[PDB]
Amino acid sequence: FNGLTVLPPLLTDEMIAQYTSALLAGTITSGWTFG
Amino acid sequence: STASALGKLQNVVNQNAQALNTLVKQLSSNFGAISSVLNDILSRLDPPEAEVQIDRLITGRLQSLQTYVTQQLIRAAEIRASANLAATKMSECVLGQSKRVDFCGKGYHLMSFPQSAPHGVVFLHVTYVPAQEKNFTTAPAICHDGKAHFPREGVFVSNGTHWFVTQRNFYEPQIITTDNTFVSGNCDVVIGIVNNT
Amino acid sequence: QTRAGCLIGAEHVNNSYECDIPIGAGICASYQSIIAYTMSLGAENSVAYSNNSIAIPTNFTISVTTEILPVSMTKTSVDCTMYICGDSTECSNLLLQYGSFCTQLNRALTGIAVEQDKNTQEVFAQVKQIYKT
Amino acid sequence: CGDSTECSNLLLQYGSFCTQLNRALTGIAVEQDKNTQEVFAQVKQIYKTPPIKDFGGFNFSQILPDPSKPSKRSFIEDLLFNKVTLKFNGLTVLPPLLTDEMIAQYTSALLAGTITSGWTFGAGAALQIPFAMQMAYRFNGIGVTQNVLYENQKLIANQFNSAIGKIQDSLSSTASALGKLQNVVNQNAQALNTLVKQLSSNFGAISSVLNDILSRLDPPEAEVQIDRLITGRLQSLQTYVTQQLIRAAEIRASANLAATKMSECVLGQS
Amino acid sequence: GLTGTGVLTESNKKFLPFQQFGRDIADTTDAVRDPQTLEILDITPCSFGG
Numbered sequence A: 001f002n003g004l005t006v007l008p009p010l011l012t013d014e015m016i017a018q019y020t021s022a023l024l025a026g027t028i029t030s031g032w033t034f035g
Numbered sequence B: 001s002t003a004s005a006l007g008k009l010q011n012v013v014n015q016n017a018q019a020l021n022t023l024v025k026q027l028s029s030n031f032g033a034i035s036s037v038l039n040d041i042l043s044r045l046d047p048p049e050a051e052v053q054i055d056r057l058i059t060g061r062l063q064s065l066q067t068y069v070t071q072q073l074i075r076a077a078e079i080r081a082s083a084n085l086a087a088t089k090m091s092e093c094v095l096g097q098s099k100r101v102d103f104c105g106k107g108y109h110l111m112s113f114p115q116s117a118p119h120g121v122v123f124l125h126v127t128y129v130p131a132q133e134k135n136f137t138t139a140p141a142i143c144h145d146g147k148a149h150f151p152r153e154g155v156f157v158s159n160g161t162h163w164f165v166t167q168r169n170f171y172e173p174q175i176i177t178t179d180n181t182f183v184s185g186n187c188d189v190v191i192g193i194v195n196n197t
Numbered sequence C: 001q002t003r004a005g006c007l008i009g010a011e012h013v014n015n016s017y018e019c020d021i022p023i024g025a026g027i028c029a030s031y032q033s034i035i036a037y038t039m040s041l042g043a044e045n046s047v048a049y050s051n052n053s054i055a056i057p058t059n060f061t062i063s064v065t066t067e068i069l070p071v072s073m074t075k076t077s078v079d080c081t082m083y084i085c086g087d088s089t090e091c092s093n094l095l096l097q098y099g100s101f102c103t104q105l106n107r108a109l110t111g112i113a114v115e116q117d118k119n120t121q122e123v124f125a126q127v128k129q130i131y132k133t
Numbered sequence D: 001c002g003d004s005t006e007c008s009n010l011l012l013q014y015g016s017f018c019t020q021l022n023r024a025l026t027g028i029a030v031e032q033d034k035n036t037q038e039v040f041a042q043v044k045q046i047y048k049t050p051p052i053k054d055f056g057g058f059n060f061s062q063i064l065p066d067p068s069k070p071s072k073r074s075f076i077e078d079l080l081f082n083k084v085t086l087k088f089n090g091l092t093v094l095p096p097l098l099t100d101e102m103i104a105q106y107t108s109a110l111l112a113g114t115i116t117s118g119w120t121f122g123a124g125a126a127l128q129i130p131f132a133m134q135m136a137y138r139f140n141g142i143g144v145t146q147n148v149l150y151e152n153q154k155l156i157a158n159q160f161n162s163a164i165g166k167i168q169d170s171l172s173s174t175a176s177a178l179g180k181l182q183n184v185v186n187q188n189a190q191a192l193n194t195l196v197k198q199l200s201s202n203f204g205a206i207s208s209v210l211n212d213i214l215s216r217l218d219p220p221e222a223e224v225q226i227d228r229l230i231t232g233r234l235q236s237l238q239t240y241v242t243q244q245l246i247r248a249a250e251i252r253a254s255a256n257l258a259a260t261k262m263s264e265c266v267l268g269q270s
Numbered sequence E: 001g002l003t004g005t006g007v008l009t010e011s012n013k014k015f016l017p018f019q020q021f022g023r024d025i026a027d028t029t030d031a032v033r034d035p036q037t038l039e040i041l042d043i044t045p046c047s048f049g050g
């Protein structure tokens, strides 16, 4: 390249998957109360 | 099995790649100078015209960079609006049950589940859809003993010989009783009232 | 000859189907050879209205549908002095007389990247704890 | 360039600006078509009102389609269409994908569906229901018991009818009530007009027409003059494209709001 | 001395006896008067498109 760079995102996809898993477990177990 | 269902993320990636590709391809233009490579201009001629050639190159490349930056700003604003909409949907249709119609799903909303995607989110909406309809005859109120009766909740229906009260979204007939109906006035001003017990 | 211009290589038919490849003025074409036709809005029915008739469902179904939304894009950075000069002292000196036209670009790009990070973090970080099934 | 070989040859060395300009314009047009289709294509079938119309005393004559006129538009739609007022130099205007008749058909289908089936047709199959009972449900939905409606039917109907007539007059006599659409049309026309007007500028050259420059000087300085003209015109085109992009973004936001309102208020009670 | 391309047709405009050519708006010529016959013509750009 000639001065063009791509910066990695702060949140890696593993943490995003972890957030999705936490949200889904919460909504399955506790209904809407945890919100 | 079926592909090409994720056209939005593909479009975003393609637009970014195309913008970068045209930006890097713009480096191979003369812009009215004698060459497109600066080293040849530096090594082929005496400076007092080298600054002229380099000036032409500089102004062309500056124009290209400015155009790229403006396009990036526009696209970023659009993506930010989309992200705000996605955040609102996640807050409303996942952490609770939504009443605003067609906001998330086609039908009556029950719940939603989120899933990740390389540059976005995917919502799975679960909805309830009625089916297998049937005709019935209906009346607005019931006149009995000179009094008008209206249902607390539901609707009066008749299969042809007898009358029942049912909930609106599911057929479940029941005998009309003084517990699921309430009285108001006399059967003289209601248009379409019928006689029953 | 259509309201959108002229078309060669396709046959005009009297039917009307859904629209595959939009053409314009309410007409579009599809492959069968290639046929061009007037677009069809949908099916046709007349609900049997009456002043003492009702319809009530007797059964139900449960449907699962999908929705897709982008939230972020790649974060990019560009260096002016290497893009337009390519490590040349004379080019740098010549560019130095154009004022500060590139600090602005760097600020804009950094703002874009920070905005992307904020977008992702605000969409996904909706909970305070991590629950386990 | 205006069909000049020298201008094309000189322009050939500025890269590929025109490809991305045309790409942006094509994207804008596609977005416009998508906006219209998303806003209006909300139903799956085309419902029709019954030939006999007795909606408990309510009167929808002013808004139902009129078969007499070929356009099949209603009174209010014709008033709105008559209210507003509005290939030259290498620029073209493309026709929309959806004709006005199709928009009117969608509007008529939505109106018939909401008149006959209540809000059910927006969540599955349209379900028949008498209008008075639907209005009783709508009162029951705002915390007022249905008891009221059946005991005040005729009066209520009268009020509704009167209100409808009033707005017709408010549209027939009073003007300047549709400033937004007129403003959009005026903005587009003015932008196109000034873009065309920019052709007569000088930009520091000796003349504003290429033929005089070509037929009055030898090439060595003709190139300089043509370069000045070319860069000026290119800058004007870029400015026009950027303004169009901004206006398109704003229009898209407005269209999204309109689609949300149509989904939430016409197909259901909010 | 006024040069340009297009298709020339007959026009019904009434040039007042001293004008030579007419333009409508945005400074684009629409009509001309030939110096010999002294009649008003009409100019239309010949067709183009993508």
Ligand SMILES: *[C@@H]1O[C@H](CO)[C@@H](O[C@@H]2O[C@H](CO)[C@@H](O)[C@H](O)[C@H]2NC(C)=O)[C@H](O)[C@H]1NC(C)=O
Residues within 6 Å of the ligand: B159, B160, B161, B162
């Ligand atoms: C309407 O519903 C009523 C109540 O279910 C039906 O009356 C019953 O009909 C069955 C079948 O003929 C008899 O075995 C029961 O003894 C009836 N019950 C009573 C209380 O009389 C009635 O037949 C239905 N009418 C129609 C046209 O389907």
Ligand SMILES: *[C@@H]1O[C@H](CO)[C@@H](O[C@@H]2O[C@H](CO)[C@@H](O)[C@H](O)[C@H]2NC(C)=O)[C@H](O)[C@H]1NC(C)=O
Residues within 6 Å of the ligand: B191, B192, C051, C052
């Ligand atoms: C529903 O509509 C029907 C029309 O089909 C009404 O029946 C009419 O009622 C009037 C007044 O009793 C009679 O003069 C007509 O002869 C009837 N027409 C027919 C075809 O029978 C009926 O009254 C309406 N019911 C309600 C509740 O509005």
Ligand SMILES: *[C@@H]1O[C@H](CO)[C@@H](O[C@@H]2O[C@H](CO)[C@@H](O)[C@H](O)[C@H]2NC(C)=O)[C@H](O)[C@H]1NC(C)=O
Residues within 6 Å of the ligand: B194, B195
């Ligand atoms: C419901 O029942 C009432 C009374 O049982 C009916 O009212 C009678 O109507 C007849 C004919 O119009 C009159 O001759 C009587 O004087 C009325 N009696 C009373 C007490 O008002 C009423 O008509 C019935 N409903 C229907 C639709 O027939």
Ligand SMILES: *[C@@H]1O[C@H](CO)[C@@H](O[C@@H]2O[C@H](CO)[C@@H](O)[C@H](O)[C@H]2NC(C)=O)[C@H](O)[C@H]1NC(C)=O
Residues within 6 Å of the ligand: B133, B134, B135, C046, C047, C048, C055
């Ligand atoms: C309900 O009653 C109607 C009226 O008898 C039945 O007939 C339908 O009527 C509409 C309009 O009059 C037509 O478009 C349909 O094709 C008719 N259906 C037939 C003839 O089978 C109707 O079928 C009944 N059932 C439902 C679910 O509407």
Ligand SMILES: *[C@@H]1O[C@H](CO)[C@@H](O[C@@H]2O[C@H](CO)[C@@H](O)[C@H](O)[C@H]2NC(C)=O)[C@H](O)[C@H]1NC(C)=O
Residues within 6 Å of the ligand: C058, C059, C060
């Ligand atoms: C409501 O719909 C469901 C699904 O269409 C019906 O369940 C089916 O019943 C038939 C007949 O017994 C079976 O052959 C199918 O296997 C059932 N489907 C499933 C998914 O189990 C149900 O019978 C319907 N309800 C009524 C009252 O008819």
Ligand SMILES: *[C@@H]1O[C@H](CO)[C@@H](O[C@@H]2O[C@H](CO)[C@@H](O)[C@H](O)[C@H]2NC(C)=O)[C@H](O)[C@H]1NC(C)=O
Residues within 6 Å of the ligand: D059, D060, D061, D062
């Ligand atoms: C609904 O309102 C319209 C007015 O917009 C009524 O149409 C009028 O009807 C009367 C009597 O038939 C005529 O003298 C008028 O000339 C009509 N007005 C127009 C503009 O045509 C219509 O009658 C009303 N509906 C009902 C059932 O009365």
Ligand SMILES: *[C@@H]1O[C@H](CO)[C@@H](O[C@@H]2O[C@H](CO)[C@@H](O)[C@H](O)[C@H]2NC(C)=O)[C@H](O)[C@H]1NC(C)=O
Residues within 6 Å of the ligand: E035, E036, E037, E038
């Ligand atoms: C220019 O010269 C031509 C030719 O002499 C003139 O055309 C003549 O006009 C008269 C008047 O109507 C006719 O009777 C002749 O038949 C025409 N001759 C030809 C050859 O066309 C024209 O009028 C002159 N115009 C001016 C302004 O002097």
Ligand SMILES: *[C@@H]1O[C@H](CO)[C@@H](O)[C@H](O)[C@H]1NC(C)=O
Residues within 6 Å of the ligand: C012, C013, C014
């Ligand atoms: C079928 O289309 C042809 C033109 O393609 C037309 O001449 C003819 O009238 C049409 N027939 C019917 C029944 O519409």
